[PDB]
Amino acid sequence: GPVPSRARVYTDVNTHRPREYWDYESHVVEWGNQDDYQLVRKLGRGKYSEVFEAINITNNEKVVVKILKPVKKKKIKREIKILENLRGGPNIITLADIVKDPVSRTPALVFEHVNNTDFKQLYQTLTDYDIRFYMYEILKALDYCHSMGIMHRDVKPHNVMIDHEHRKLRLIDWGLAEFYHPGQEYNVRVASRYFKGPELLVDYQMYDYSLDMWSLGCMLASMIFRKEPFFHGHDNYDQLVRIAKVLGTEDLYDYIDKYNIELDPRFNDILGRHSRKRWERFVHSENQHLVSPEALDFLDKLLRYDHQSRLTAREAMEHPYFYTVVKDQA
Numbered sequence: 092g093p094v095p096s097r098a099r100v101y102t103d104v105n106t107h108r109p110r111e112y113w114d115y116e117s118h119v120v121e122w123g124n125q126d127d128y129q130l131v132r133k134l135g136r137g138k139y140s141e142v143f144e145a146i147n148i149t150n151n152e153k154v155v156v157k158i159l160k161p162v163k164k165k166k167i168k169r170e171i172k173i174l175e176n177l178r179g180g181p182n183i184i185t186l187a188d189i190v191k192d193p194v195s196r197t198p199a200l201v202f203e204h205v206n207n208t209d210f211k212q213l214y215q216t217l218t219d220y221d222i223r224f225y226m227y228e229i230l231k232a233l234d235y236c237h238s239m240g241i242m243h244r245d246v247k248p249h250n251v252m253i254d255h256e257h258r259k260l261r262l263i264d265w266g267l268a269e270f271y272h273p274g275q276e277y278n279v280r281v282a283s284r285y286f287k288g289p290e291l292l293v294d295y296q297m298y299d300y301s302l303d304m305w306s307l308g309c310m311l312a313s314m315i316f317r318k319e320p321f322f323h324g325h326d327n328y329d330q331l332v333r334i335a336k337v338l339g340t341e342d343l344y345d346y347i348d349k350y351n352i353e354l355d356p357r358f359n360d361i362l363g364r365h366s367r368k369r370w371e372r373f374v375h376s377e378n379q380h381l382v383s384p385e386a387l388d389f390l391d392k393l394l395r396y397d398h399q400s401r402l403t404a405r406e407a408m409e410h411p412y413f414y415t416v417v418k419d420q421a
């Protein structure tokens with residue numbers, strides 16, 4: 092069978108916690124009344140949720156209401172308990188209330204509101220400093236939740252709020268987040284295609300926090316090269332082909348052989364033979380102003396087949412790419 096794997100940081104933090112910290116299936120939820128909040132308008136819809144701007148009528152504060160589409164009650168307790176465990180952590184969205192509509196009885200989460208910016212205008216004026224500043228802020232949120240025994244598993248642009256007038260960032264949607272336990276085998280059908288780590292695409296199930304750091308590397312690559320998404324695959328299998336055409340196929344096959352992964356019979360005939368590309372091949376006149384040796388060095392250290400050899404959140408925050416943003420934060 093497959094060769095085991097353990098996270099090389101924060102490996103046992105959940106085992107040293109009280110059982111109730113991670114045993115979310117027995118978390119008792121106190122359901123308030125959604126009639127404390129008046130919905131203003133729809134902000135988005137997903138597989139697992141519809142999200143609304145709303146007003147807290149008690150104090151007129153703008154707020155956000157996520158009405159959960161019908162999932163296993165388990166998964167709702169999971170998201171609540173993760174949100175409750177991370178409350179007050181750096182750049183993690185704050186859960187404000189837990190309610191049920193009194194007529195429909197369906198469960199919903201109330202979150203803090205973030206005054207987002209025109210992202211269309213943001214990505215057309217992005218500076219090199221902006222990318223380094225907000226990458227750093229996302230890393231603060233990942234290192235914290237990782238240190239708290241929790242993988243986000245759905246890191247992607249849609250899940251980063253930014254109030255640029257206030258340089259304020261929040262990591263949202265913890266509905267796929269999960270507790271890390273050494274030796275546990277997780278569902279690979281998580282995250283969005285363009286950000287899925289190779290471990291998800293080859294059905295390696297004993298993955299860990301390092302899955303988030305792949306996803307972060309996909310974000311980095313699309314920003315600095317102005318190509319979104321960076322790996323644009325038609326399906327899950329063509330997703331690994333897109334990656335193979337860049338990271339190369341020697342390395343992917345060492346990865347398979349190292350963890351003794353049984354590769355799908357579909358993949359043999361489509362992965363081919365491909366050289367590892369030099370990152371220069373994705374630089375051009377319209378994106379060079381965001382590319383630098385340190386940027387590329389940091390990106391290359393995030394996008395590794397082998398989850399174990401990618402940078403940890405904390406290692407990432409010590410990379411030279413962030414030297415000037417760390418300085419200015421003092």
Ligand SMILES: O=C(CCC(=O)NCCc1ccc(Cl)c(Cl)c1)NCCCCNc1nc2cc(C(=O)O)ccc2c2cnccc12
Binds near residue numbers: 136202205249264314
């Ligand atoms: O607008 C976007 C595009 C997000 C985007 O492109 N960002 C910039 C990426 C980026 C750019 C530059 C850099 Cl340099 C980097 Cl690194 C990254 N997506 C949101 C649509 C859904 C509805 N929005 C709200 N959903 C919530 C969901 C929850 C939850 O489920 O927990 C909690 C709270 C909220 C919430 C709170 N306040 C306001 C709105 C919402």
